[PDB]
Amino acid sequence: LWIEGIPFPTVYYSQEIIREVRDRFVVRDEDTIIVTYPKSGTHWLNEIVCLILTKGDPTWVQSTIANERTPWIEFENNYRILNSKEGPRLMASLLPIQLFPKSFFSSKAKVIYLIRNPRDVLVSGYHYFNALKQGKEQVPWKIYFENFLQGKSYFGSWFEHACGWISLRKRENILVLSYEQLKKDTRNTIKKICEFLGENLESGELELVLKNISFQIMKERCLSNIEKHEFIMRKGITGDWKNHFTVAQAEAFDKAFQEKAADFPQELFSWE
Numbered sequence: 001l002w003i004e005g006i007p008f009p010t011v012y013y014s015q016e017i018i019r020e021v022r023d024r025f026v027v028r029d030e031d032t033i034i035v036t037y038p039k040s041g042t043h044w045l046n047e048i049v050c051l052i053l054t055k056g057d058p059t060w061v062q063s064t065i066a067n068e069r070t071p072w073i074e075f076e077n078n079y080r081i082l083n084s085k086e087g088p089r090l091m092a093s094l095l096p097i098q099l100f101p102k103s104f105f106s107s108k109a110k111v112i113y114l115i116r117n118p119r120d121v122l123v124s125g126y127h128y129f130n131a132l133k134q135g136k137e138q139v140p141w142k143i144y145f146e147n148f149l150q151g152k153s154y155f156g157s158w159f160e161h162a163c164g165w166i167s168l169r170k171r172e173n174i175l176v177l178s179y180e181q182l183k184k185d186t187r188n189t190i191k192k193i194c195e196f197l198g199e200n201l202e203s204g205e206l207e208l209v210l211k212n213i214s215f216q217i218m219k220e221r222c223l224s225n226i227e228k229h230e231f232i233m234r235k236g237i238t239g240d241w242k243n244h245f246t247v248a249q250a251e252a253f254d255k256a257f258q259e260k261a262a263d264f265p266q267e268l269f270s271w272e
């Protein structure tokens with residue numbers, strides 16, 4: 001289904017809902033949003049955000065689900081519950097910039113946009129989208145590669161979703177993060193988001209938020225609902241694409257990228 005020329009999953013979304021979210025859904029200055037592209041460490045960051053809030057106690061995140069923890073605006077009829085006004089409102093989304101609520105661009109509510117190596121995103125998506133895809137209807141590696149190179153993937157081309165969203169990286173209320181800088185520069189990134197959010201830490205609580213976000217701890221984690229509960233934590237490693245991209249595929253990816261996103265490749269593109 002192409003909703004406003006955008007590819008979505010076949011359920012949990014509608015045109016009336018996604019159109020209503022872009023033009024008339026209203027964000028308060030006190031509402032926070034976690035916007036990401038799929039297979040980029042979405043659940044990781046979400047859990048880090050909640051674990052700072054609880055001062056590192058993981059009991060809350062064990063008895064909850066990411067959607068039922070940070071509801072997703074465009075997800076089904078969730079926006080109806082979200083219209084209830086409760087001071088601070090924590091939400092999440094996966095939308096590219098052109099379809100994000102137009103109202104947000106005139107208000108200064110806080111947004112965290114997470115990014116990851118598209119090749120690692122490609123590899124992470126390939127595994128997950130083929131984990132439990134009716135057995136042998138599972139897509140081969142080449143089909144998936146050329147499908148990612150074109151825009152044929154959920155929530156659009158990774159380039160347009162990113163280019164549109166990262167055109168605001170130097171804006172006041174925009175915080176851009178990388179999955180890579182969370183793997184390499186882990187504790188000093190949490191100190192940096194705490195500076196953008198005014199939430200402060202004590203030298204005991206820091207060693208607690210940081211313990212329970214580790215892959216292994218998070219790997220051992222309430223109700224398993226409709227989505228895959230166990231095939232989410234696959235590797236958690238950075239640069240697994242080198243185990244998947246042939247050299248001819250890495251050249252075809254480097255030429256598409258070096259042509260598509262021309263203006264942004266300076267900092268944050270330091271993953272290597």
Ligand SMILES: C[C@H](CCC(=O)O)[C@H]1CC[C@H]2[C@@H]3[C@H](O)C[C@@H]4C[C@H](O)CC[C@]4(C)[C@H]3C[C@H](O)[C@]12C
Pocket residue numbers: 009012038042065066067072075128129227228
């Ligand atoms: C169902 C679909 C995958 C279909 C497939 O097997 O290709 C997946 C891919 C991305 C998923 C979403 C994203 O992972 C973000 C959210 C994560 C939450 O844990 C559930 C809701 C949430 C909004 C997910 C709903 C649903 O499970 C989605 C939309």
Ligand SMILES: Nc1ncnc2c1ncn2[C@@H]1O[C@H](COP(=O)(O)O)[C@@H](OP(=O)(O)O)[C@H]1O
Pocket residue numbers: 037038039040041042043044120123124125127213214215216218219232233234235236237240
């Ligand atoms: N606690 C954690 N620490 C490190 N990586 C994590 C993590 N939780 C999830 N991830 C990784 O984040 C990716 C999932 O992205 P998303 O959250 O957007 O669906 C997966 O990558 P891999 O498939 O490379 O293992 C998963 O392993």
